[PDB]
Amino acid sequence: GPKFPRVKNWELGSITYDTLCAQSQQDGPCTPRRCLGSLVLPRKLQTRPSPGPPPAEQLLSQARDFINQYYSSIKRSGSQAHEERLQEVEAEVASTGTYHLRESELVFGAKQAWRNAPRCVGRIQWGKLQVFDARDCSSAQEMFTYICNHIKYATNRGNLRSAITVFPQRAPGRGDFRIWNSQLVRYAGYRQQDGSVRGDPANVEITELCIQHGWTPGNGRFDVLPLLLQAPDEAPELFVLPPELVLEVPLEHPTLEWFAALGLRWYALPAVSNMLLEIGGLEFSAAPFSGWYMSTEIGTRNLCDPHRYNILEDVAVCMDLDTRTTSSLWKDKAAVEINLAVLHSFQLAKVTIVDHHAATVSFMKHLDNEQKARGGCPADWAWIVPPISGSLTPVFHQEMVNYILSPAFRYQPDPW
Amino acid sequence: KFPRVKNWELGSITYDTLCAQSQQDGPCTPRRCLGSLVLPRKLQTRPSPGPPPAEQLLSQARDFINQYYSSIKRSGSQAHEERLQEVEAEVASTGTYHLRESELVFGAKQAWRNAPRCVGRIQWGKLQVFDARDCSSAQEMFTYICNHIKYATNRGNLRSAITVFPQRAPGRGDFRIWNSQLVRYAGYRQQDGSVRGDPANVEITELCIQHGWTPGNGRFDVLPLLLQAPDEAPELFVLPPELVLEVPLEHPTLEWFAALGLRWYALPAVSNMLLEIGGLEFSAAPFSGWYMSTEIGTRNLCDPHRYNILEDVAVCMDLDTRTTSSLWKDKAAVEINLAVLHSFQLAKVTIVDHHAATVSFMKHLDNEQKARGGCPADWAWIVPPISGSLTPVFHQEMVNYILSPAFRYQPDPW
Ligand code: HEM
Ligand code: HEM
Ligand SMILES: NC(=[NH2+])NCCC[C@H](N)C(=O)O
Ligand SMILES: NC(=[NH2+])NCCC[C@H](N)C(=O)O
Ligand SMILES: [Zn+2]
């Protein structure tokens, strides 16, 4: 039949064809010989620091592509404003090597990038992103102000709002604007004497970086890291977030009274800050974005991963389960309760959060929407299906096609 | 070239060089990954009314023959050369060839070893291989199948096994087991479109009735087999109740669980897949091992399109099924998987939980890394349907590709 991937939902037995992938202009990591879909960091999108100005020819075509995308979204493709804008871009690139985006173009692209992210199960909210334009920012100090405003507006006292702050794009020769931290809010990872780690093992390197840069470390298991903001061609400066801006939620269980005694907690705002936002060729090296958590992110990955807090065994001992044999499913039991606790503690503190059931159901709706609007929706199965109760969610039974569309968020090399 | 594979829990890394030996193509392309698809769009297995290109078959054959002799440490040996000539000669004169028992045995085990979606491959070396090529009738197939089931079951102490019927032949119909598994529960469509029993077996359950089977009306009615001899309407055979071992499900502490009347068979034996060795195709080659608890407790019993018992258990556990956030669903799934493990252990029937299983698979990955330089794996299928990140495989990147000998999906014979 149709010459496009045939996708099936085994729960409903329904079929669809992804024609949207035909618009992908960027190759992924797979080949007919072998599939590399499970790789986290496939050396593909990897936006390596490219000092020498981008091939005006390559950039121009990427630019003409985005502009077409923009005028199309406003239903003026082929119009006078469209062709003139197209001329304006080529002109500007002709005499400067690069070009700039209009305000409304940035807003559109930022949303498309989110809309195009294959690993985000929260894309049903893609149309409501609040885009803060910070392309005027000229200092690491100013960056801190923008970030603080971002956190304030986004946190909104527990009633979270999606947002993204876009700092200056990359300029030929000049240094990039960068946020060294992986997230605006992260807990410290202190390497111990015996070799173990106190806090979040994931953040050991950045913790040692803040220290090498003048940060007086604490010694807790949940210390909020300071920010390492870097303006063009300068060494990063250190900024400490005002405690009042960083909303946190103590974790307690709805019925296991002892859970609260564990002293576990998590912050409310998930703000990825080390990803590159690419729009029409232009590269925004610093554009932290944030939404709200899906409970398994905290309860299953962050708190139970072997290489993170790894609290599975402690909670199992507390529930008095048989941690000496796998068939007792002690891991599965403790994981459930830990997840439930996160859901309970966030609801109680009136802080926005969504469970994996509600979340995936909403993504199914998002898929049905995009099927009609764009002919498909790029999705990374391994990242869409929740870390616990996979086949209990409807996404598990939905086949998915993964591919890269632009605008887009890409991983980028650490500045150091 | 060779993919760098990382394990995010240990920070360890490896390079898959085995994928280079892949001669067959998957559905992926650089433009888009289609790895999450269950069935191939084109990678099917087209009819065999005409003989395959001698050069194509001959090369697949030589390669396999090379694999065999290398396995027994006698490459370039005299026997190796003479065997290659035997194959050449047979192909050139008849358009095909035949395998010798030992080669068949080596092939079957390799097919399992190369199965990307199988998590139990650490056991790949211990496979009992029944040569059933000396078969010429559906009734003979039935006897063969009954012996496989007897041996495989072994009073609850399961043993991996496979039975290989006659290979496919040009212009001649295929020997086929119409059933997807040797043991399956009927699926009866009722008035309001709903289904009594296993919804996944509605179609096969119907074909059986159509061929004269007196259907039952239960939720776990073991279906009969529809065996087909070349170019002959399939025949109906009823499995001797004593041969089909079953496990009644109860819960270690929830006394009421058993009152649900849930049960499941002990033998997981896929029978609709095709076994390809050195270009030869075996359309009927049922194989079996032993279940991993989540296959029953999570997928078969809790899938929406299966027995979908999640809510019933939830109500009995008196859970708040008003909102998703109460995780009533996750809580019930865990007890259902627990009952499966409890029951099977209580009935002294082989079974492996998903934690033990994945740990064993990691070991296998290592054994294979050193033994062949890689191991083709399909992440979505290796990672359990529940508690994924709670198992080690979740955190292990994987490369997936097609190696031969291999098990492949083939068209439904009707
Ligand atoms: C509104 C609520 C949102 C929810 C529930 C949601 C949820 C998720 C989850 C569960 C992940 C994967 C978690 C993991 O395995 O690490 C994720 C990844 C991602 N999300 Fe969203 N998201 C939301 C908002 C945002 C926003 C506002 C943006 C962009 C402007 C966004 C962009 C992305 C990207 C790029 C990734 C993948 C990042 C990576 O590869 O590590 N998300 N999201
Ligand atoms: C010894 C115990 C075994 C265990 C515990 C085991 C476990 C598994 C599991 C969990 C799956 C995924 C099932 C699904 O989600 O549908 C699977 C798939 C598979 N296994 Fe095994 N396996 C075992 C033995 C065998 C044997 C003996 C063979 C072959 C000789 C085999 C061949 C395969 C194949 C071909 C698949 C993929 C089936 C498909 O594509 O639908 N397995 N196995
Ligand atoms: N809900 C989100 N926007 N999540 C983005 C990724 C957050 C990451 N998984 C974390 O646990 O911090
Ligand atoms: N352990 C196995 N060999 N399983 C093969 C597939 C069985 C199938 N998943 C079932 O639930 O019946
Ligand atoms: Zn792929």
mmCIF file of N, CA and C and ligand atoms in Angstrom, chain A residues 29-31 34-38 402, chain B residues 27-29 32-36 400, ligand 5:
data_model
loop_
_atom_site.group_PDB
_atom_site.id
_atom_site.type_symbol
_atom_site.label_atom_id
_atom_site.label_comp_id
_atom_site.label_asym_id
_atom_site.label_seq_id
_atom_site.Cartn_x
_atom_site.Cartn_y
_atom_site.Cartn_z
ATOM 1 N N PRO A 29 21.170 7.311 13.617
ATOM 2 C CA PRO A 29 22.265 6.336 13.708
ATOM 3 C C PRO A 29 22.082 4.939 13.088
ATOM 4 N N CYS A 30 20.875 4.604 12.648
ATOM 5 C CA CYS A 30 20.639 3.272 12.094
ATOM 6 C C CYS A 30 20.972 3.095 10.613
ATOM 7 N N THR A 31 21.004 1.834 10.183
ATOM 8 C CA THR A 31 21.250 1.457 8.788
ATOM 9 C C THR A 31 20.508 0.147 8.599
ATOM 10 N N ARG A 34 22.104 -2.748 10.724
ATOM 11 C CA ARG A 34 21.847 -2.840 12.160
ATOM 12 C C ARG A 34 21.163 -1.610 12.749
ATOM 13 N N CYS A 35 20.300 -1.855 13.736
ATOM 14 C CA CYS A 35 19.561 -0.798 14.422
ATOM 15 C C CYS A 35 20.280 -0.364 15.688
ATOM 16 N N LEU A 36 20.531 0.936 15.798
ATOM 17 C CA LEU A 36 21.207 1.505 16.960
ATOM 18 C C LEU A 36 20.261 2.412 17.751
ATOM 19 N N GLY A 37 18.964 2.116 17.672
ATOM 20 C CA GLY A 37 17.957 2.912 18.353
ATOM 21 C C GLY A 37 18.053 3.026 19.859
ATOM 22 N N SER A 38 18.621 2.020 20.513
ATOM 23 C CA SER A 38 18.737 2.039 21.965
ATOM 24 C C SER A 38 19.874 2.917 22.499
ATOM 25 N N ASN A 402 10.980 6.665 14.709
ATOM 26 C CA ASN A 402 11.838 7.718 15.243
ATOM 27 C C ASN A 402 12.689 8.333 14.135
ATOM 28 N N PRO B 27 14.623 -3.200 9.138
ATOM 29 C CA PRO B 27 13.726 -2.179 8.580
ATOM 30 C C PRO B 27 14.243 -0.748 8.726
ATOM 31 N N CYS B 28 15.293 -0.576 9.509
ATOM 32 C CA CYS B 28 15.838 0.749 9.730
ATOM 33 C C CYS B 28 16.635 1.322 8.554
ATOM 34 N N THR B 29 16.728 2.648 8.531
ATOM 35 C CA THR B 29 17.479 3.395 7.524
ATOM 36 C C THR B 29 17.967 4.628 8.271
ATOM 37 N N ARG B 32 15.084 7.150 9.241
ATOM 38 C CA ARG B 32 14.206 6.854 10.371
ATOM 39 C C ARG B 32 14.376 5.438 10.898
ATOM 40 N N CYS B 33 14.285 5.302 12.218
ATOM 41 C CA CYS B 33 14.393 4.010 12.888
ATOM 42 C C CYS B 33 13.007 3.383 13.058
ATOM 43 N N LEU B 34 12.877 2.118 12.667
ATOM 44 C CA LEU B 34 11.612 1.397 12.790
ATOM 45 C C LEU B 34 11.793 0.194 13.707
ATOM 46 N N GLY B 35 12.785 0.274 14.584
ATOM 47 C CA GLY B 35 13.053 -0.816 15.498
ATOM 48 C C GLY B 35 11.917 -1.263 16.407
ATOM 49 N N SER B 36 10.984 -0.375 16.749
ATOM 50 C CA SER B 36 9.896 -0.773 17.643
ATOM 51 C C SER B 36 8.800 -1.568 16.964
ATOM 52 N N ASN B 400 21.089 -4.175 17.335
ATOM 53 C CA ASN B 400 20.231 -5.229 16.810
ATOM 54 C C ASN B 400 20.451 -5.414 15.326
HETATM 55 ZN ZN ZN C 5 16.568 1.428 14.385
#
